[PDB]
């Protein structure tokens, strides 16, 4: 029937990612106005973003535990509940710690919801994991593009608190409704030889090489997500140009995931990782120079950088499922989400402080160096490292 079809659950996962896209990708544009009204330094609001992403490292493995053992329905229920709680009251904020706490709660919900959607995609498509991961990550990267006008129209017409409460209610209700339908391909759990547990995966050096590579890659991407608009203005760009640039970078970032997933399906995923990371390092090294050329040059740099960076969010979950089994995959990708959070530590507050004290060029140099490190690890270290033995 319909509920037995393989691609229906992929569509449900993409819908879930589309719903939760706004929580993370609406920040790129609204970080500066939130700083302006709160009257605090940019590092404060960037640290709020950092907290929202860091709590995901402790959240996503927790939800993945329940998803792996008992199924994804109840975990998705309470993840949607947490997202609803965080986003609904986000409008009535007038203090810095209130924003900190509410955004952290919303991020904690978003992390487990993302983990569930990606796990559903990967488990439902063992033969094509790159493509399913790419479609799901594309849903996560592109859902902000239609969502942002809707909340923006409500803010001008009805206000801030009403907009946040209404969008949070809609997202939570839709996530709860989707949690009724989604299911795993099986319908208990059986462990095979290729299934690595949490401790067994953490033991092998392959997992930590991948973790370090993901941590190094996410530096420039997350710093751009946090501070493209302030850096763009430091380049001397009008508000309209920066908004068009944010839309373009979001579009390229979202559209890259299916393409890089298809490449990772048709070629070794490690070689795709190496190519993507090398291109990202090249773009980040050249970013201050080409971006200083003009508006078109800056926006093109942004689009290429986000293309490369977002390519990895289909590369890594499929690699994790391929290498360390399928029955343990949700909480297994939670530990890579931990690397994402550890990189978001620099992507937000720490990178903002680095830019404040030494200029944006210093932070961009840091991102380029970390991207080169990740390129070195992916291209030369891990392809000859073999598969884990356990």
């Amino acid at each position, epitope marked *: 029937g319909l509920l037995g079809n393989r691609w229906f659950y992929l569509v449900l996962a993409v819908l879930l990612m589309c719903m939760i896209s706004g929580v993370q990708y609406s920040w790129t544009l609204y970080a500066n106005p939130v700083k302006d009204n709160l009257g605090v*330094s940019l590092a404060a609001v960037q640290t709020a973003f950092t907290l929202s992403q860091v709590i995901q490292a402790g959240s996503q493995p927790g939800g993945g535990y329940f998803v792996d053992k008992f199924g994804p329905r109840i975990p998705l229920m309470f993840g949607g509940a947490m997202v609803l709680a965080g986003w609904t009251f986000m409008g009535m904020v007038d203090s810095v710690p209130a924003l900190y706490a509410l955004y952290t709660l919303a991020g904690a919900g978003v992390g487990i919801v993302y983990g569930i959607a990606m796990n559903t995609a990967n488990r439902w498509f063992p033969d094509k994991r790159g493509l399913a991961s790419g479609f799901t990550a594309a849903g996560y990267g592109l859902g902000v593009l239609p969502f942002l006008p809707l909340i923006s129209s409500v803010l001008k017409v009805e206000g801030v608190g009403a907009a946040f409460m209404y969008t949070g209610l809609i997202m939570g209700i839709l996530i709860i409704l989707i949690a009724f339908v989604i299911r795993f391909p099986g319908q208990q759990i059986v462990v095979t030889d290729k299934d690595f547990n949490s401790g067994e995966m953490l033991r092998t050096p392959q997992f930590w090489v991948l973790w370090t590579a993901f941590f190094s890659v996410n530096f420039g991407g997350l710093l751009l997500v946090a501070n493209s608009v302030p850096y763009g203005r430091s380049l001397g760009l009008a508000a309209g140009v920066l908004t068009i640039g944010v839309s373009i970078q979001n579009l390229f970032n979202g559209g890259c995931r299916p393409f890089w997933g298809f490449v990772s399906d048709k070629i070794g995923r490690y070689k795709t990782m190496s190519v993507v990371f090398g291109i990202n390092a090249v773009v980040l090294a050249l970013f201050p120079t080409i971006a200083a050329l003009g508006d078109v040059a800056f926006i093109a740099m942004l689009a290429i950088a986000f293309f490369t960076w977002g390519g990895s969010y289909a590369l890594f979950p499929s690699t994790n499922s391929d290498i360390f089994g399928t029955a343990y995959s949700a909480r297994n990708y939670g530990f890579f989400w931990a690397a994402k959070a550890t990189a978001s530590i620099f992507g937000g507050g720490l990178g903002a402080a680095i830019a404040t004290n030494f200029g944006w060029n210093t932070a961009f140099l840091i991102t380029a160096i970390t991207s080169f490190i990740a390129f070195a690890l992916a291209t030369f270290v891990i392809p000859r490292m073999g598969r884990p033995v356990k």
Partner: antibody, heavy 117, light 109 residues
Framework: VQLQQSGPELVKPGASVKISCKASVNSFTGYFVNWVKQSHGKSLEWIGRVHPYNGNTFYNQKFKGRVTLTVDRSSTTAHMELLSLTSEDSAVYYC???????????WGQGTSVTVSS | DIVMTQSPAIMSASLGERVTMTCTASSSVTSSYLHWYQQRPGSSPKLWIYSTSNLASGVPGRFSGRGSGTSYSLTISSMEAEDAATYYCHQYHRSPPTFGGGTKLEIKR
């Protein structure tokens, strides 16, 4: 985009001062209106800022409730009203358009207000 | 707040010379939130440099702006008669915004 203010003002101490600032067709598109003062042509210090649409007000602690900024709702003029005149209130007041980064793109010629018994 | 001191307060430079003035802040300022305004003696303040690097509309290219952290500098490659004015730096790292003490630039002869 151009900004025009009221003429010079002579006011006895303790009275009310009302300064107008006229704007162009859509000058306050995504901009606040910022009110700043210059003491004697040597020092700049911020008075306040107001949103031309929301009416949201942000004021310095120097002028806590002394000053009220109000936009005319046609996005054509903004008014600064001060009410606790003392000796150090004699200065020139400037209105400007202020984007999200506190950059004041365009200013007015200024309005010289003097308190004199 | 954040106190900004501009040095020197009054300076004299010969026509055609290279002019550099500095604006030091008490705390670190994010480079996107520090601007420079040039005020002629009889006229109103005019936007000159925004976000520490970029010149406003209708500004000659001889004007340069550098700086990061706690120190910022406005530089003129070749001094001109039209460049003689007062320069105010403007910070918005944290509310409330504050302005510098001003640098009075005069022409030597």
């Amino acid at each position: 985009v151009q900004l025009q203010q009221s003429g010079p003002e002579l006011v006895k101490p303790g009275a009310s001062v009302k300064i107008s600032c006229k704007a162009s067709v859509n000058s306050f598109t995504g901009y606040f209106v910022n009110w700043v003062k210059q003491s004697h042509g040597k020092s700049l210090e911020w008075i306040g800022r107001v949103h031309p649409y929301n009416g949201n007000t942000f004021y310095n602690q120097k002028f806590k409730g002394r000053v009220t900024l109000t936009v005319d709702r046609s996005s054509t003029t903004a008014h600064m009203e001060l009410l606790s005149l003392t000796s150090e209130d004699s200065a020139v007041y400037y209105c400007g358009r202020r984007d999200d980064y506190d950059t004041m793109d365009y200013w007015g010629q200024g309005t010289s207000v003097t308190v004199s018994s | 707040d954040i106190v900004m001191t501009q040095s020197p307060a009054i300076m004299s430079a010969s026509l055609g010379e290279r002019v550099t003035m500095t604006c030091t802040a008490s705390s670190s300022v994010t480079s996107s939130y520090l601007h420079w305004y040039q005020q002629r003696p009889g006229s109103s303040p005019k936007l000159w440099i925004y976000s520490t690097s970029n010149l406003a509309s209708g500004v000659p290219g001889r004007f340069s702006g550098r700086g990061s952290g706690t120190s910022y500098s406005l530089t003129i490659s070749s001094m001109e008669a039209e460049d003689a004015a007062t320069y105010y730096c403007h910070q918005y790292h944290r509310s409330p915004p504050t302005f510098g003490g001003g640098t009075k630039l005069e022409i030597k002869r």
